[PDB]
Structures are given as structure tokens and as C-alpha cells.
Design an enzyme around this catalytic site. Sequence first.
Site, PDB file in Angstrom:
ATOM      1  N   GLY A  34       0.787  -1.235   0.000  1.00  0.00           N
ATOM      2  CA  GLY A  34       0.000   0.000   0.000  1.00  0.00           C
ATOM      3  C   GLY A  34       0.816   1.279   0.000  1.00  0.00           C
ATOM      4  N   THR A  35       0.115   2.412  -0.065  1.00  0.00           N
ATOM      5  CA  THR A  35       0.756   3.733  -0.111  1.00  0.00           C
ATOM      6  C   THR A  35       1.338   4.103   1.252  1.00  0.00           C
ATOM      7  OG1 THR A  35      -1.249   5.032   0.396  1.00  0.00           O
ATOM      8  CG2 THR A  35      -0.825   4.532  -1.935  1.00  0.00           C
ATOM      9  N   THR A  36       2.221   5.097   1.265  1.00  0.00           N
ATOM     10  CA  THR A  36       2.908   5.496   2.492  1.00  0.00           C
ATOM     11  C   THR A  36       1.991   6.354   3.372  1.00  0.00           C
ATOM     12  OG1 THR A  36       4.969   5.570   1.192  1.00  0.00           O
ATOM     13  CG2 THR A  36       5.062   6.412   3.456  1.00  0.00           C
ATOM     14  N   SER A  48      -2.372   2.164   5.912  1.00  0.00           N
ATOM     15  CA  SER A  48      -1.812   1.720   4.641  1.00  0.00           C
ATOM     16  C   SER A  48      -2.183   0.264   4.430  1.00  0.00           C
ATOM     17  CB  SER A  48      -0.292   1.853   4.654  1.00  0.00           C
ATOM     18  OG  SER A  48       0.102   3.204   4.814  1.00  0.00           O
TER      19      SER A  48
END
Lengths: 195, 250, 235, 231, 111, 243, 241, 240, 244
Positions: free
Chosen positions: F29-31, F74
Amino acid sequence: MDIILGIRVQDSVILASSKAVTRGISVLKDSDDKTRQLSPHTLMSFAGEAGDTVQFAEYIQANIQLYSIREDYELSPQAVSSFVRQELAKSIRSRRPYQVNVLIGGYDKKKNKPELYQIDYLGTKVELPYGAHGYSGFYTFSLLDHHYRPDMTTEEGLDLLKLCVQELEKRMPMDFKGVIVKIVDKDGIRQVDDF
Amino acid sequence: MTDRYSFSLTTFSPSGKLGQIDYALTAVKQGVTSLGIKATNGVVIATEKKSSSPLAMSETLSKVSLLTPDIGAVYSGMGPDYRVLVDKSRKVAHTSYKRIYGEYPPTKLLVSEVAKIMQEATQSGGVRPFGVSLLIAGHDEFNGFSLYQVDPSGSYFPWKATAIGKGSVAAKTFLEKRWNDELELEDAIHIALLTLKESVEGEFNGDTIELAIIGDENPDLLGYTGIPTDKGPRFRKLTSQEINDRLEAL
Amino acid sequence: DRGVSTFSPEGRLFQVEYSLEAIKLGSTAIGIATKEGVVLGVEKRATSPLLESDSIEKIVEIDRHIGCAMSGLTADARSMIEHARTAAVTHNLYYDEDINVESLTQSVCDLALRFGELMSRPFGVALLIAGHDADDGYQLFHAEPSGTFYRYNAKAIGSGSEGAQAELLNEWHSSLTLKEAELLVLKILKQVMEEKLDENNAQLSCITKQDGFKIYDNEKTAELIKELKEKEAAE
Amino acid sequence: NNYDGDTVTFSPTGRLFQVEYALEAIKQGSVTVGLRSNTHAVLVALKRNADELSSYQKKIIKCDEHMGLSLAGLAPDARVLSNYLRQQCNYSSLVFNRKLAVERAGHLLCDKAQKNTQSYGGRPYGVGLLIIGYDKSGAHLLEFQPSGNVTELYGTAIGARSQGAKTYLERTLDTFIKIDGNPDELIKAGVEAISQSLRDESLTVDNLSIAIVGKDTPFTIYDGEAVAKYI
Amino acid sequence: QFNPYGDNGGTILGIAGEDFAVLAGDTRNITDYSINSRYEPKVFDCGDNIVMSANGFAADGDALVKRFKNSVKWYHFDHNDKKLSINSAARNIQHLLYGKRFFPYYVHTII
Amino acid sequence: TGYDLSNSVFSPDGRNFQVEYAVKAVENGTTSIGIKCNDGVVFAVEKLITSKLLVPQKNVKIQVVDRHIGCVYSGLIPDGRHLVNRGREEAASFKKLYKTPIPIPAFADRLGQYVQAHTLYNSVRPFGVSTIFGGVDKNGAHLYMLEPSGSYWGYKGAATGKGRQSAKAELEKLVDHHPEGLSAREAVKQAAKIIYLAHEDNKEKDFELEISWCSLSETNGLHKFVKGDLLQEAIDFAQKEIN
Amino acid sequence: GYDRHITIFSPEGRLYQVEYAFKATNQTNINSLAVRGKDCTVVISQKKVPDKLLDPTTVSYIFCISRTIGMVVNGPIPDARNAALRAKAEAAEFRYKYGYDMPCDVLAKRMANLSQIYTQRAYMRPLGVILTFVSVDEELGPSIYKTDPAGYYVGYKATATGPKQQEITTNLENHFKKSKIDHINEESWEKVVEFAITHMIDALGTEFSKNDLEVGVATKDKFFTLSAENIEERLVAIAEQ
Amino acid sequence: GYDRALSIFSPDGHIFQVEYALEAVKRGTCAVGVKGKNCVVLGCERRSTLKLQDTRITPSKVSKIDSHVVLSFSGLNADSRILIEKARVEAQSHRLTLEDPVTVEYLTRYVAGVQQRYTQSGGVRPFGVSTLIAGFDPRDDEPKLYQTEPSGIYSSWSAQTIGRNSKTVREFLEKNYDRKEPPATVEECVKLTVRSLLEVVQTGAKNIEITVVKPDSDIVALSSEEINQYVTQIEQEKQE
Amino acid sequence: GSRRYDSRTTIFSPEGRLYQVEYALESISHAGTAIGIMASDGIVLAAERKVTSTLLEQDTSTEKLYKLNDKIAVAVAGLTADAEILINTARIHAQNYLKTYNEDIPVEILVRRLSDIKQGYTQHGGLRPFGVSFIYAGYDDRYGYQLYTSNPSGNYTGWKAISVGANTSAAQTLLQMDYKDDMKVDDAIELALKTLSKTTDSSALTYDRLEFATIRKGANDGEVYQKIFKPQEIKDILVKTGIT
Ligand SMILES: [Cl-]
Ligand SMILES: [Mg+2]
């Protein structure tokens, strides 16, 4: 509903049941049969609260007929009466009890003896030589205490029964429109058409 | 979520074996030796206290347990399974008997209730069998003294004397030679200590051995006086000192 | 094994796709919709000559204005018909009117996917639901165990379906009479049926606004079979 | 492979294969396009038929007077999810006398789809949805995926060959966003967008399905001769 | 003891012509001897050319109308925007009222 | 083997492979980050702009619990939403019974026990999110990070997602260089920088910055989003540092 | 081999899931120790904070279950907290139902029975933890009782748990051989804590700072944990002797 | 509750549990039903590997559901008791509410519905039983004979057989039974039923059961000697 | 989920057999033999105890023969624990019937209901069947003396003489040889013991490895008596027939 009588004689049981169905100030019917055949040699007459009576009678009838088919065998009058008593004994502690009183007249084929059971709506069972429910008993019991003999024939039992109906027609306040009489013996159940 | 295991985890194999029961019996075989001997005027049950560590207090861990004032139990196999069975066995003695009849159940019927619980773990959904064999010693008025074994299957058998667990095969042979129908309670305790020494390897004293009896009534252990009919428990756990006294005249 | 409500890598429910294979094994059923009515016809397919063919009930009434034909595991259709009948009568009780054919079909199709780990598996039967209402007129619907339903001008389901559907493609036009449609069902049934078509092994039915849903007698169908054979020999 | 038997199982790389297989059912579904300006929001859907004798599968569903969606994938699953939206829109009206925000509509769908991906026995929804609506903060367009992921967009498309329409809208972004106070021109842009996803087939009268909602326009669907204007 | 019913007064009146119909009602709302509102409407347009009023206990009347308006909405959803006929509306309202046979809506309804 | 096919099964190591597989979904996932400051906490997240067609500022990922707690995560976004929905139910029942708003450590355990409960049975799947959350209570500021196993600790700074190692390294420098403490307004600016620096591990698609904060002085102890002039000021600070 | 996935017997009468839950115990790589004084019960555990970003005050494996009972866990923190919350609820319920504070050994038994259920029932996994309960019981005095994933429990004169448990165990065994008694013959709890730390230093062979240890102390009518400065004060006392 | 979907579809579109239930029927003892002009006759095989039996008390193969309807079966004996009980209960329930005994078609439809329900209910396997249901509707003299099977399908038959070697006896009936002219009398119908069983049975001693059902609840079971007379008569005519 | 570990106890094989029922019967075939013989004036129940140990308490033991009521008894073959579950159910059912009808339960009705319980475990619930076969010996006023057997399938049948458990094939052949219809109880006692003595896997048949019971009308005038034999009574009957 009101008048149901029963007399056990030597070789048979005789049940007499009133024909009137009254609601309010109107006799709605004068030919009502207040009885159901539970098995070939067992007859139940009934009286009590409107609706409850027939609903209860037919429910018992269905259960006994189911038993007969399952085992290919007829339950004894004693066995049927005990079943009926238990159903009423359950009923009395239900949310809405069956307010139905019954007489069970049957001929035990194994004992070769007639049997008459009186069961009230509480589940109070007694075997008797003669029985009645409701206000009828207040006249018929004393009458039968006097005139009844244990060794009587069916014809003598019918004359004894005529004596009860005559007394009830004389002293009862309500018109119950006569009775339907039925005899239970070794040969099964039959109706007396001219009474 | 929710227990989705509504099916049996013990089933018949093609050979007719119930695998999980057999495997539970294997777990019992690995377990420490325990035994029971029936005398004319009593019953003895005994076992070794296998200490997990010398820092552990083996007094706190009780392998021999009171179920009723006149019934005691010992086991071989998995200790945790035994502990919960004792809890359930104590409770069922009250719920299914004492609260109905106002008296404690006879040995055979309490055994029957424990057996039922163990049978249900063999057939009910999402559970394994109990990994223990129990020896239940007890007394009641109409049956007298009795000793029962209960296995993981739920089967139970009455015994004059027997042993279960690690060295049961040798221990049963030893008991066959020594047992007679005229044994007094003290003689049975003596034989129990002799039989148990064979299976024990390390130290053999009152601190490493756990032993209890079903014998005479103990008014001193009742806790009150005034009711003549109440005469006290027949179950008594022998103390560490009481065991060592009998080990000198061994 | 594997879950009942599992998706395949292609994005289809295994059990739904397998039930579709069961429907292909079933006996043929054909429906044709016209402006004068909707005709429903089926292959009875008696497994033995001793079987009394008139007891094979593969065309069924739902209400006076809605009929139904089936194909596949026909035992599975009983509870679907029961639900349809109750839905139709219940709607009449609540709204004092006939229920729309589409709304009835949608109610039946809501049962379809109510399976998993509700019933244990999808239905193994496809239904042709034919009817009439005041709004959308004469209608024919194909109800599958996927929960999907398509309206059709004409449709065939069962073992001879792909062959019969190609034949219906050419023959159907928007000006078909009822009589023409009756013969067309008989014609196409006779082509795809294994045994020779007659009044005892094939059954016709229709739904009209005036007379409602009617299953045809064996005497009436026999005359339509005889009328069909004469017309094909006539050119 | 060994980790696609049910939705409760993660793969070694952290994937949910049953959710991805449900996602695959959307790609097999017929194309549908969504786009909006500041005043209106438009759905355009290519309907699919079994054959020439069959009807064309209805793609667009109304949820309230101010909201509705188009579907792509399992139609019964769209019926379940649209029915849930109808109830949630209706609950907001009866209890709070409040039109349900299009953003909350998306949040509710996300949470409903999620519960099916974390529990044993159930399965993920096998359908993707494009929700349009006009609420107190103007025109909106949402994209629902059965993984649970909901996304607010100016324009988008889902179904087979949806990449063609999605690229067109990405180019046309600056043009169609400013089609304010003009329904027919916003629809035209949507019809031109869905045309980029066509192969061999073209837009006919009983093939095309259009829906619109806006400032002074309730959610209304156009089919049949009503869409002949835009061919 | 808590009494769940009340009387909000007012009166309503429906008359049918050949090609039209009227449903009238006064706008007064009361409790006991007090006026609550001089203008509180109780005759509503429910859609599909059906007008409705449920006069008696206003809480029950509003609840019923609200439920019927909702019934009309779901009739459209479930039956392809079909117009709810007046006879079909009447039957639907019967089931709404009879559903509370043993804890009634204290209203006299007219559509 | 087959120990990794079912949740709640111990491998011979003593590990629950299904939970470790959920961690891979988090790493994908994204930060997202969290920074503890003088009198509060700051949260920031990377939002990947997949397309021009995404409406700016209108796909909000940071979520509020009660009025004083912020949550960011995330991994699988829907799983995070499910956890916050539970968190809101937990916080509501706490306030209902005990009157006071839920303390952050108390709230942390409510999520912890719920996430841990999803590692006890094979009928449920573990959570596919690491959740960074916190706020201000009676005892001051608290920052927490919760993982798929149910494991959580208090943090001075926290980071998770694809650019976690880059963000952790940058966070460790702030802890060393500011022992006395970091201010709330500073932490917002630093949060922006760290997301921009952590974006180097996800640099194909350009991104959108989103920040929120709780502070006893700046936001009066309530959770608010950073918007407008304060947001643009933090973006400009981050843009200046990368060049 | 599905008999290794759920808690059913293997052919050799074993529960592999229980055995693998025991191996999860050491996943944290922490060693705990418990000893009894005259008036007190002391428990100590290693505290390892590897990440610099962690708030070290929140990193703890010691729990205050009730006012009188303390608990240290060897195993992963999620399962540790699961057990802690349940023990707290059980201790509170006991007091409400039976009108007196739950004894340490009774709580240990209760938590052990719960653990036993997970070894018999299939849908519930065992917790991968070993729970060491400590108190000064009003009847039995200083008490140490320890629970494991098998559902086993027992009282202890002293005990240790962790990867290097055996080294600590024998160290304590040799002391009680020498002293000839069941406890640490010491008046103040301060010197019992000093004993505990000293013997852990000897057994493990490592030196400790104030932040490398975590200490819990049970006295009559209260259990409490020591702060970093309380431990530092204690470390200084050992060093100056 | 145990929920498992045991009856499910396979790739080829078959429900194997329903099909394997049919194999249990194929294993069961043979049962035959033949309907005449004014009667129906139910014939049943009884395997002769069981000697030292007590035929007085052993469950009979033909069961009365009501006084006017009978049910025979092939397949799992224990399963058949559950269907018979349910059918008997429904028969009395129908008399109670409709004030009229069940038709043979209605009773069949009920039993068939029960069988079908067990093919798509969770946690249950299908009934390993096929039934022949025969009788006469109330106040009706037209003979009725129906067949059911595990799947739930049912249908009416002029004559039919089920169980082991049923395909052989069905072959016999298909050529020997004339639709245009069914067995005119009771004797003719019983003889054709006994003949059909003699193709499969072994010996005509205590292996064949025969039950004759006539209109207005007139049901009687034939004894050994009565059946043996048909066996003796058929064999003497055969030697020709 | 849990589907992985389900044995599916209530399914058909491709051949149309119930796996678990067949395997339960295989289990029962290793259990101690039990014989029932019905005479004109009574019934005999004889059963062999499973490999006895010398230290087993024989007099206060019950493994094979159980009393259901005053008129009905059962001999067990299989898992004793499973049998006791079913026995307590049967004991309750008999008392329910007596309470309802004021008549002792007919033998077949009790047998049918107990068999219907076993049937249920083969069709639904996903549980293993009961690994038990019963021989029912009882009397009622309809059919008189009756012998039945039931097995894990839930199928029951009536018998003049029957065996269950181990060596039934050999035992049934011996019973079929020497049994006749005009047989008395004392003759049936001798037949039961002689059959066990030949079919036994033990070296010699002794009193301590047997359970024995009779149901006679040997009480005073038109009434039935159940006699569960004591150890010494088995010892005497074994000498009287000339086996030891
Ligand atoms: Cl407990
Ligand atoms: Mg009385």
C-alpha cells in the site's frame, strides 16, 4: 353444548348427547352431533367452550387414527383415556387452556368388557358405571344411584337413559332439543335413530 | 466467526478403529503410573508426583482429588484434561444427584456420569477425546467399597485392583500375585507402596508420592458436631509424614 | 473439496455454471411470443412406454395470466412454482390487481442465488415464464439459476436448444399469428426430438388476454400435428 | 493456486484471489461510461443481448430522485446493492428528512462489500457500479469496485474495452467539465466517449441506454426512441 | 398510567365528480381546549394523482401518510414505474391499517 | 506443510503465516506516517493520483474517531474503514458509560483486541492494514501504530506502507535533532517533507498530499484537517527541501 | 496431515498445535524471573526496545491484573494483552460474585482451564504465551503460579521463563540447595529485587542499564511496577557491594 | 447446526449424491406394482439368505399410509421408515383440514417433495429410497399407481418395478402388459405380478409378498399358501 | 475455513453404501459375541465378556446385558459407552409411553424409536454413528415373546434365534442347525452356551467370562420375570449342561 351422559351396562356403553347449539337468544342448530369416533370401538362425547370442543375432539381423533395406522392396532379404551387425560392436564397450565369436558365410552376387545371414562377440562379422569358433565349430573347421578344395576342389558340401559332424558326435559331450564344416542359394544359403534 | 466445527472429529476408519480414541489411549500410556487396590474394609489409590521442576511446589499440584466426601479420583495421562474433568465431575454429582435426592451419589453412578462426559467428547462436534484414564475409588451404603477405571472412550470397568499408565503391564502382574479377598486396608496400602516403587525411578518418599484412601468415617475431618447421622468423610489423603512411617517398615 | 459460493478464475460461480450443464441434459421446451398471444410447448420424454405420459407435468399455471414451462431437474421447479403462485396471489391480495409478468419473474429469480454455506445448491432447472399484462402486453421470459432473466420474442431451452434457437432466429417475425406460432413450436419440436412427435409425447399451451392460460388437450394438439404435416407436404 | 479456495485466505504475496476473480467478472461485463459537469451528471451504458430474439439487459438502476447507478458484471449482485442503496437513501429521508450525500452512499457500499471479503462462507460481490447524483455539494460521480474501493471522479468507465472511453475522457476532461446548464451537450460527450469502446458493433436505438441527474433534473433514464436523438 | 393516544381535532371532506375529485380539510390543530396551530395541513398529495388525509390522532395520521407515500415509492421501484391506481392504493392502505388491528392508528382515513 | 493455508494455525516455528501474508498487503500500500509533537500529534498520507479524472481533495483517506482521535492506514483501504467503524463504536460505548471521551491508550487496546481477535479463528481473515492513530487526552498527546497481528506500541514517530524505511530514517533524525521536542506547526511542515521524500519509492504516478493534526494549543485538542494556506505552506516547504 | 493444523491427537498421542504454541512463547526473545521474599514476591523481565522511534514507556510485558495480583507474560504482545484483559475481567467478576479478592492460584487455575479448552475445542487456537502470576496472598503468603498453552499450572518457590530459562533455573536451584529454605530470607522488598537482578546477571552473563530491565513487585494489599529511576537506584545499590 | 452442502453439482452437471442414492435403490430388494381394471397389486421380493427369521414381527415391505393408500419401496430400509411416518402424519393432517382423505397423487406429490428437499438442504444426504405408491382416491374406482425416486421426480405408471434386477422385470412387463386391455380381474393382475417376480426371485416359497388393494379402503395381504398356488399354477403352464 | 477438516460422515459411496455405517459394523465384528434365542415359553440372552482379567470384579459388573424395563432387556455388541447413551434414551422412552397410555410399551415400538435415532445419525448432523448393535429380548401381550436386532444403520429385524458381534457367521450356522420351533427355555439355554463354547476365540468357556439372562413366564400365574444370572448361577448352569 351442555348435556352429555354416559351409562356402562353389562355388554355395552351408551352415550347420550344433546342436539342444541345455542348462541345468545338463538338456537342456531337442533341436530348437532357432539361426538367423534376415535377408533372402531372407542367413542368420545364432548361439551364446553364454543370452538374449543370440536377443535379438541378432532385433534384427539387425528392422533388416535395416526396411532392405529402406524401400529396396525387399536388402542384400548384405558390407553386412549390416559392419552386424552394427559393432553388436558398439559392444556390446563397452557397460555389458553382447552375448556372442554369429555366422556370416553369404549369396548375393550381383549377384556371383553365395556368401559366408561369421565374426564373434565382439568384432566381429572375417573372410570364409572355411569357419568355426566355439567348441570346434568345434579339430576342424573341420584336417579341412576336408585335405578341402575350392573348386570343390565343394552335395552334396559336405553330405558334407564330415557328416564334420565325425561327428568332433564322436566326440570332443566334450557331447551336442549333432545339427544343423539350411540351404543358402543363388541360389534363397534352404532347410532339409535329413533329416540 | 462462530464455532463452524459442528461435525465429528472422531470417525470410524475402514478397519473399524476409532483413531482419536486409540491415540488418546496412546497418550495415557505415556503418562505416569497410577494404581488402585480394593481391600475388605477400604480402598487405596496412589500415584507418583512427577515434578516438572525442583523449583515447582509439588504440593500445589494435586493428582489425587476428592470428588465427594466418600469418593476420590486419580489419573494417568494429560493433567489439564484431568483437572477440568474433576471440576465437571464434582459439579455433576450435585446437579444431577445431590440437588435431587439430598444425598451424594453412589460410586457407580458418579462414574457413569463422568463416563458420559468422556463419551460425548468422542462423538460431539468440533472436539477431541479426553486424553486420560481415571481410577475412581469410593464407598456408599448399599454397594460398600468399590474401584472403577474410566477410559477415553467413556467405557468403565470395576476392579479388585489395577494400574494404568507408564508401567501398568508390570504393575498389574505384581498385583495379581499379592491380591487376595481377605486383605485388610493397611495390607493394601503396603502392597500399593511396593507396586509403585517398581515404576518410580528417582526419589521415593512422602513428598514424591501421592496416596489417598477410602476407609472408615473421619468425624475429626467433618468440621462440626451435633448431628449423629453425619459421621464425616471416608475419603482421606495421607500426609507426607504418614507415608514415610510406612516406608520404614517396608 | 471447495466452497459452494466460489468464483472461478474467469469470474463465474462454479456451481451456477455446473447447473447450466444439468439444464442442457433436460428435455426441450420452446416458447414463442406474438401480438395474438404467447405459445409454450415441451417435449415430455417418457423414460419407458409403461409410464402414463399424461402425468408428466412440465407445463404449469402460475396465475390466470401467467404460464410456465420447465427444463432440467424438474423436481427443483416445484418450490419455484409454489413461490411464484404465492407471489402472484399475494400481490393480488395487497394491491387488488394482476401482477406484472416481469415483477413475477424477478421474484422467482431472487430465489436463484439464495444458496451457500438458504439452500445448499443452485436450482438445476431453467424456466420459460410466459404471460400478459396491461402495460407491456404479451411477454416471454427465460429465468436461469444464475438469477438472470432475459425477455425473448422466442426462446428454446433444453437438449435441442442451440439447434432450435437457430431455427427460431429465421422463422420469427413481428406479424406472426397465434395459429402460425402453434405450428412453429410443433415443427421445431419434431426436428430436435429423438422419438417421433405425437400428441402423447409432446404438449402445447398458450396464454391469451381473453381466455388466460390454457394447456391444450391431446385431441386439440393432434389436429395441429396433422395440420402441420399436411402444410409441409403441400410445397 | 492453493490460496483461491475462499475469500478468507491471503496469498503469500498478500493477495485475495477470490476478490480478484470477482473483479474479473466486471471486465467480462458490457461497457458503461460515467461523466459529470458542475451542473449535471450523466451515465451512458452499452446494453447487451443474448441474441437477436432476446431483449437487451438493462444496465441502469434508479436509487432515489437525486441518485442512481449503472452496472457491469453480475446483474443480481447489482440488484442487491442497489436495493441496499434505495433503503439507505430512504432511511435518510424518513428519519432525518435529508437527501443522502453521494459520498456517504459510496462509504456505505464500501463497508457492505468489505464484510463479504473477510468472513468464511460468503463471497465477494461480482459487480462494479458507477454511481451518479446531485446533492447539496453539486454533481458527483463515483466508481464502486467489489473489493470495497470506492472512488470519486470527474469521469470514468468500466466493463469490456473500458480503457478506450477512459482515455478519451482523460483527454476531454477540460472540455466536458465546463458543459454547465446544457444536458444534451453533456450527453453527446458521454455518447462520444462510449463510442471509443466499440468494436464491429455500433450504437442502435434499442442498444443505447442513457441516464441523467442535475440541478433542476431528477434522476431519469432514457431508452428506446428517446435516445434516437443522440445516434 | 401513560395514554398513547390523543385527539388533535379537525375535520375532513371528500367529494367525487364525473371527471374530478376533491379532498378538503381544515387547517386547525388542537389539544383539549388549546389551539396548537392555525395552519397545519393534513391533506397531502401522495403522488400518482392520489390525495390522502388521515384525521384524528395527528401522530398516527402523519405516520400512516408517511408509510403510504413510502409504499407508493416502492411500488414504482418494484413494478417498473407503474402508476398506482386508486383501487390498488385503497387495498394497500387496508393492509397498513389492519397490520395494527390490535394497537390501531386512531384515524379516519380518506383518499 | 500447508500451515499457511489457514488462519490461526501455528507453524512449527510458532508463527501464524496468514498474518505475515496480511503484512505483505500492507507493504504493498501507499505510504502513511504519524509524528508526535509537543502538545499533540500530526498525521500525513500519500494519495496516488491514478488519473487526471480523480477529483482533487475529494477522496479523503484520513478518518476521525470521536472528536479527538485521528486514524490513518496503509494497505487494503476497506479493511481500514471496517476497523475505524469498530473504533467509533468502541469510543461511543466508552463515552456512553463513563461520560469522559475515550483515552488514547484505552482506545488503542480496543482496536488491538479486535484485530487480535481476527487471528484466533480460521473462519475470519486477518486485517490487511497497519493503522497509525492517536490524539490528545487528559494525560497529553499519544501516537500509536497497530499491525495485522494485533501488535501495537506507543511511538515518537511512526511510518508504514511502501516507503516506510525512507520515512523511518527521516523520522529517526527528527527524534535525535529535537530531544526537547517538536512543535505542532513544525510537525505539519516536517510531515509534508517526509511524505515527499517517501514518494521516491512510488514515483511512477505523481501524488496528492493530505495532512491532519490534533494539538492542545493549535486545534484546541480536537482533530482537524490541514487545508488552504497552512496546507500550501507545508507543500512549499516540502518542495524546497527536495530540490 | 491435518492432525498438525487443529488440536486433535496425532498417532503418538500428541497435540502439535499446543507444542508449536510453546515455541511462539520465545518469539520475543525475552527472559523473565520470579522469586519470593518473606513479605513480598518480586518478578523481573528483560526490556528490549530495538526501534529508536518507539515510545519506551509503552513497551511492557508486565500487567497489573488486580490491586493484589500482577502478571508477566512470555510471548507475543497481542496474545499477552488478550490474556491480560481476560484475567482482569475474571478477577473483577470473582470479587463481585464471591465478595473477596481473587487469589493468585485461583486465577492461575481459571486461566489454565481456559487454555485447556483451546487444546480440546477445534475452532479456538491456543494462545502462544506463558503467564506468570504473582501476589502476596492473604492465606498462602508470597505466591508464584505459572500457566502455559497446554493448560498446565503449578505453584513455584521461584521460577524463570524464556529462551535462556534453563540457565536461570539451575542458578536458582543451586542457591536454594545452599540456603536450605523455600524463599529469599530478606526483610525489605528492595533487597529481594536486588537479589533477583543479581542472579539474573550471573545466569545470563550480561550487565543491565536502567532501561534494559522491567520490574514488578507484589506486597500485602498491592502490586506495583518500578519506574526507570526506581530500577536505577536498585542497580546502584548492587554495584556498590 | 451442521450446514455442509453434501448434495452439489459436478462439472458434467450431475448431483453425485442423488445418483449414488439411486445405486442404493438398485441394491435393494425388488418391488413391483401392476394396476388392473378394478385393482392395483403390489409385489415385493424378500431375499432368502435370511433363515431363522420371525415373519410375524419382521417389518412388512408394504406399508399402509392410510386405509385407502399403500406404499412399498426399494433401497435403504431405515430411510423408508422416515418417509412412511411423514406420509402417515400428512395423511391425517389432510383429513383434519380438508375433511377428505388424500388423493394418491397428492400423497405421492408430498413424499416426492420431501425427497427433493433432502437434495438441496444443507447438512443432509438424499433418501436412498424409491417408492411405489398405490391406491384409490376417495369415492373413485379408477386405480392409481405412482413412482417416486431420490431426486424428487414422480410420475404415474400403468405398471412399474424398482430395485435390484428391476430392468429385467420391466422388460417382462413392457411386452406382457397391454394398455388397451389391462388385467380385467384380481386373479389376472396378481398372476401377472407373480409371473413378473418369478423372472428374478429364485423360489416362490417365502420370497414373494403380494398385497392387493381394491376400491373403498379394501386392502388385504396374501398368505404363503395363497401365493404358492399362483406359483404352482404358473410353473405347470410354463412346461409346454 | 473448517470445510478442510470435515470427514463427511453422512454420505454415499459410488456403490451406494454408507461408509461410516459399514466401518461401524466392522468395529462391531470384533466385539464379544452375543446370542439371543427365543423359545415358546421364554427367551435366552447369552453374551461373552471381552478378554477378562483375573482381577476384574465379576459380580458387580455390567458390560453386555442391560435392563430397559421389567419386560424388555438388551444384549450389547460394540462400544459400551455408546450403548449406555442409547440405553438411557430407551429407558426414558419406555417410561414416557407408560406415563402417556398407562400401559407397558410394546417391544417393537421401543425398538423402532431406538433404531430411528440411529438412522438420524446416518442421514444428518455430520456426526459419527453409534458403534453398537443390540439384541432386544422382550415380552408384551400382543406378540408375546420377541427377539429383535438393530445395528448402526438404524435397520431392525425380528428373529427366532440370532447372534451379533464376533463370529456371527459361524454362530448363525450352528443355531440354524440345532434350533426348532417347539423348543423350551431350558433347551435354548443349553443351545446358547453350546454355540458360544464352539465359536469362542478363548481356549475354554468359563463362568467368569460370561453374562447370562432369561425372560420366562416362570413367575406365579400369567406374569413375566427377568433373571439376570449371578456368577455362581452361571457356574452352576455351565456344570449342569456339561461344558465344565
Ligand atoms: Cl474454570
Ligand atoms: Mg370429572
